[PDB]
Design a protein around this ligand. Structure first.
Ligand code: HEC
Ligand code: HEC
Lengths: 127, 127
């Protein structure tokens, strides 16, 4: 769906921005600094699940650019493993949210965050 | 979820960028320039439905900025009508996509596009 590589870059950056907001906005809830409404969090994690599937199709071959490291494309299998593993961490978060289980939500939230970082460490350039 | 107005602006701009891609990428299909796979389009319109609910919460009071016109906030009811009407145009598109009905999809697509423009005409500043 992208006319030029720049369009893929803009898409993925926008998708990742939205994911970051839907993930990060739960930090106060996880920490107990904001109240835990199970229905609110269930709905939010549903949005996050949808968003978390979107960036990867915008790293198609030849869409080098932005702050993407070239290693994304020189080992396609390894990058795919990282995004699929991340999406499975989101599945654990979804299961916790759907169950209304705050303890599971906290644990899953931590693992999701670690998975964001694991990918950045291998595949995102320094600012 | 926004620390400053700038954060709301970045969010809504990213959400609208993603909506524009999920909408616009169907243009060749509507026009018959690309093939019509009912399952592909059903899935895509599902993503669009989710995305099309997201921008409006990022136009909270006091989040003037970007290319948003101030009229968004001086008549809250009218802006709400436009976004709710737009989301109902997306509902027609969803129903068409879910039915696998290309004729309904074309018609709904046109009405959705008109609704994007109707809002821009009232509420988006010139570049
Ligand atoms: C690879 C499997 C990734 C996972 C998992 C996550 N991110 Fe990441 N992110 C990745 C790359 C390669 C990039 C650079 C994209 C580019 O082309 O520039 C990023 C970037 C971000 C950004 C910046 C977006 C922007 O506005 O330019 C944010 C805010 C971001 N990523 C956040 C984020 C969070 C919170 C994640 C887990 C919930 C996460 N990312 C996962 C690669 C990957
Ligand atoms: C109000 C009810 C709107 C509807 C319906 C749509 N859009 Fe719009 N859009 C609106 C505003 C007020 C703005 C400016 C936001 C800001 O603060 O700057 C926009 C902007 C866009 C953009 C630019 C995003 C960016 O990267 O900065 C795009 C690409 C965009 N809008 C596309 C778009 C499409 C295709 C729509 C229907 C499917 C659509 N918008 C609806 C307000 C409204």
């Amino acid at each position: 769906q992208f006319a030029k590589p720049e369009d893929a870059v803009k898409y993925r950056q926008s998708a990742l921005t939205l994911m970051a907001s839907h993930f990060g906005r739960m930090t106060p809830v996880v920490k107990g600094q904001a109240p835990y409404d199970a229905a609110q969090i269930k709905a939010n994690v549903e949005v996050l699940k949808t968003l978390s599937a979107l960036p990867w199709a915008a790293f198609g071959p030849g869409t080098e650019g932005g702050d993407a490291r070239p290693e994304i494309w020189s080992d396609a299998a390894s990058f795919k493993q990282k995004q699929q593993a991340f999406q499975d961490n989101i599945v654990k978060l979804s299961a916790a949210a759907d169950a209304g289980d705050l303890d599971k939500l906290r644990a899953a939230f931590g693992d999701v965050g670690a998975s964001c970082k694991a990918c950045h460490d291998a595949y995102r350039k320094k600012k």
